[PDB]
Amino acid sequence: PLRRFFHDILHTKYRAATDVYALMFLADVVDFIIIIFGFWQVPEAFLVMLLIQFSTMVVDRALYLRKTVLGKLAFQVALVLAIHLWMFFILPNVVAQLWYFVKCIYFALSAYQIRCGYPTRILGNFLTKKYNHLNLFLFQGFRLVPFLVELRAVMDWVWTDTTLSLSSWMCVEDIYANIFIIKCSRETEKKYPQPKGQKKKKIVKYGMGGLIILFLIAIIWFPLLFMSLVRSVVGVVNQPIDVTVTLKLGGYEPLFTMSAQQPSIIPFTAQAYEELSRQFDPQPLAMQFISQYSPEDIVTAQIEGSSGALWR
Amino acid sequence: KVSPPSLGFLAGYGIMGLYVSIVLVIGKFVHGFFSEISHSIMFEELPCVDRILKLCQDIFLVRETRELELEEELYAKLIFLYRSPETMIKWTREKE
């Protein structure tokens, strides 16, 4: 009984109406971003999480465009339980802690949508509302995302009740997008205009031009820099396991194979390294060699000398 | 020491190759703006776009109220505005 009452009062109720889809989607975009960045069994896990973020965002769009509070309730319940059960499937972390955190924000804003309701006017692109600069910039980069524009169009078409086709739908979306961008620019020119026959202003030029040049620099040079930097880093210690000194003597039959292995080989400690470096400190390059090589790098060649292995 | 013994797929190449591919495709996405901006200056330098956003927003309003007959009719206006450049000039006049 009590459960039924809770659900009844989460569906029928008498509350207000807010549109927090923008923020829910932004939370999911951040989640996607950090999972993509968090590629670090692990690739397979990150790929499944990708498909997941994506599928859940699509389902969210469906319920938003169909204004389903009951559907959102169901989705929320399922998702909460499933994401919390995925904490048990840790077997493939700061990245995961952050993913949990941002998904918690999504669950909080989603819960808000359910307990408030869906507003009558749901259609309309977020970044085409006002014609201040922030809306302009957000709309631009948001649309810039490779497949976001087309996904939005097709998806919306499938849920929204239309008489037309997808091509027709994409036409009105393109027109609107372009018209918004123009409007924002027109508005900003009315807010702040320059005079006629008046230099656009050295500074304006220097700024935009500079940014473009720097962006182009970061297309070619920066990747090279990053690449080389990583490659230069000598990753993990490589120490000779054994010291095999075969003093091949006899031209006919080379022998003298008295040698040693790991037990005799001593990975030099930090203190030991200091000793060697100081021994050869007068000679700059000698010390350099020792010092540059990381501690527990320089290994000790304690080659065995005793015999028994007969000369042949 | 050796130089590359890191983990996560192939630090040397699986994620690395994917990253490169992404960068390139994002490259093309961004070029998609600053490459052919000059092929539209014959329908993009329109002044006032207020009358066109009204049309666009009326299509949206008529889809929320589910009077989809008028959706078809207002779409017809949108496509004729964009089918005849001279009517765009008329409709996008600064004042009237």
Binding site: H133, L136, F137, F139, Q140, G141, R143, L144, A177, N178, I181, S185, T188, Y192, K201, I203, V204, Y206, G207, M208, L211, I212 | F33, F34, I37, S40, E44
Partner: peptide
């Protein structure tokens, strides 16, 4: 002040170039 406003406008028209300037 004035300089800051001009700068704002600078990067602003620079992002104007981000989806058809």
């Amino acid at each position: 002040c004035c300089e800051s406003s001009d700068c704002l406008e600078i990067c602003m028209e620079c992002c104007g170039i981000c989806f058809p300037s």
